[PDB]
Design a binder for these strands. Sequence first.
RNA 1: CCUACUUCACAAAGCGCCUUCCCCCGUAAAUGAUAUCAUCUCAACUUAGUAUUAUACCCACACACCCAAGAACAGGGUU
Lengths: 156, 177, 37, 146, 94, 71
Amino acid sequence: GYVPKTSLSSPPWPEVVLPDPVEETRHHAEVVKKVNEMIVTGQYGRLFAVVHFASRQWKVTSEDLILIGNELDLACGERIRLEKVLLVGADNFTLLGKPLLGKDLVRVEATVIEKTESWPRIIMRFRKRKNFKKKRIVTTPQTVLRINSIEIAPCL
Amino acid sequence: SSFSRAPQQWATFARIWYLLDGKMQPPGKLAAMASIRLQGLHKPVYHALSDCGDHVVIMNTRHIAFSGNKWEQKVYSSHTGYPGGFRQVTAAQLHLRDPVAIVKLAIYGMLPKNLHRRTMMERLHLFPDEYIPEDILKNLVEELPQPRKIPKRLDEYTQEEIDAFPRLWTPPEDYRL
Amino acid sequence: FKNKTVLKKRCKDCYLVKRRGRWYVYCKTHPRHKQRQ
Amino acid sequence: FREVVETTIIEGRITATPKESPNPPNPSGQCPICRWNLKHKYNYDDVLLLSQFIRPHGGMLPRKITGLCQEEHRKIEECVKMAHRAGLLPNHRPRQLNRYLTRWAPGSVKPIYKKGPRWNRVRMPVGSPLLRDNVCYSRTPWKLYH
Amino acid sequence: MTGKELFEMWKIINPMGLLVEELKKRNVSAPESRLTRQSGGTTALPLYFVGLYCDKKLIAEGPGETVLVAEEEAARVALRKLYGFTENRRPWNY
Amino acid sequence: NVELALTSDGRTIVCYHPSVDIPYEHTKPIPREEGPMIEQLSKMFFTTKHRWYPHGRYHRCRKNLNPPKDR
RNA sequence: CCUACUUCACAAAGCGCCUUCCCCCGUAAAUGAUAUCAUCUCAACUUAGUAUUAUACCCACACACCCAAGAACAGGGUU
Ligand SMILES: [Zn+2]
């Protein structure tokens, strides 16, 4: 099956070798232990987190403000836990869920700071030469949430 | 991180100088690379209105290579505006006249057709040969890999490589060759 | 030359050659046979 | 390989001739390409392969002598033309615009003064259709016309 | 002080001198200012990254338009790192 | 320069990406009329002339002098 | 452009005078393989074969009056 070395003999992209599973698992355990030790020793400053709230993913950090385009049925000043945290990251490490991180790992907490209405949005329908003209004004409810803290735990 | 606001903004939106070597390169691939860099589409902070384009310095544009018979078939058309002022010039003739025109036109055609295009083209520096002005050279920051890997000639192949390649067939001894 | 869409050798010395992109019937003996595609 | 030497008196002497490398990957094949498993794995720039079927002055060698299939002889001939036009065989010469993948001789193509409408565009050929069956390493087929 | 920068709150002059003083208090030699990255040196919009090295070890690097500005701001970054008031520091706990 | 590792259960991916410093050896020591005006500015800043011409009072008054500021 | 001639007359004109500079490619060849002859070659290669127009022209940053400059403006002169 040997083919002499030509331009088309081998694929242009470099060939890739699957690492031996034993060494792969050893390296995985080493990295996980190192990061867990960093968490235990608190070797991180600000934490950010990608959190799935409402229908969207928000890149979030402590003290951040988030504008949800709907009322939440929460009194202002009420503290909440954001439960669908997809990602949590520090300066030196990041943890990725598949797709969601465990509750034991990350705790993202927010506070309902404001409940408002959006500025009036205009919906205008017009069709030429049809006497078709319609105008509507819609205000969407909104809630401003402040992200108070992001805590991680050594549960890797 | 931990920069002051103005230095941070300056670093983020600073414009970098890239170097492309056009020797034996297709002008189209050179133009693709250069147009990306000139627009700033290589930057994650890109936005059409942020003016985040970079400088591209293409050297050896005299030594570009066209695939196929484009040197003879590709025709550049212009009009002087006056009647009978339609001029059609093959790529070879245009290259002989101006050793920068082909790459310049490729990049111009690849850039977005808006008012920023000529501002971008002001950041494009084309030099027919290896020589580059001293100030431009001092500005240079990075050199982009050539889009096309130049095939080697037999004169360039090492005897070791020739030997490593097998002989494919037995030539009959009784042959003039 | 005579322009023909189909080239036909006429005598034995009429030979086909593809030159400058198109086919030609040349002939030394009877240059009357010269054809161009 | 016999060479003719003059001094008038002229005579032909057989000189050293290379032999096929030992251990072909696929012995008992029609053509050398098939014997060595290179059916669809060589391109115009593979000079090491191409020059093995080339006269010292650049011309191709006859198919009877080479043993190549008809299709493979055609492919090698076209690849050799392209390599010569690209300047990859500077020493196989009879005695300045950089090109490559040139199907036609440079002096035989007319400029495309009137490229047609979008549905009937006159395209500039690139490479050779003879290599259409080469190994495809790209998601999109390589275009023979630009 | 949330969102504020250390030297946006505490106005200082000669951050390089102040950093030298701090490193003396820590019994460390004066840092070596060294040009790590550069761009458009001869143009009207240069970018200079200047890093301060303590025994061939980078302590902090900063950007700027001129080499002097980049060095000054690298000193500011070094001061922030030494004082632990970095941008990515642990947020205040409430 | 990133180390990837699934956790033992395989439900969370851990990425270790420390910040790599620039080697000292990879550094250098610190060194120690309207028409012509617009041409000079255009050459200086690698722009076109059109940017540097003035605008009418209408455009200037349209411009917002107290724009909102974020962060 | 006005020396003459002519219409004319401090000048404008022709009917008068002066000056006007390289090519483009259809083919014809040389050597020569595929196809050991031959073959001008959308084979490599060597000529007729040249546009890569050659040039020439122009190029001084910063009242009033007169003018062969001119609708205004502009331009030239005022030693
Ligand atoms: Zn005949």
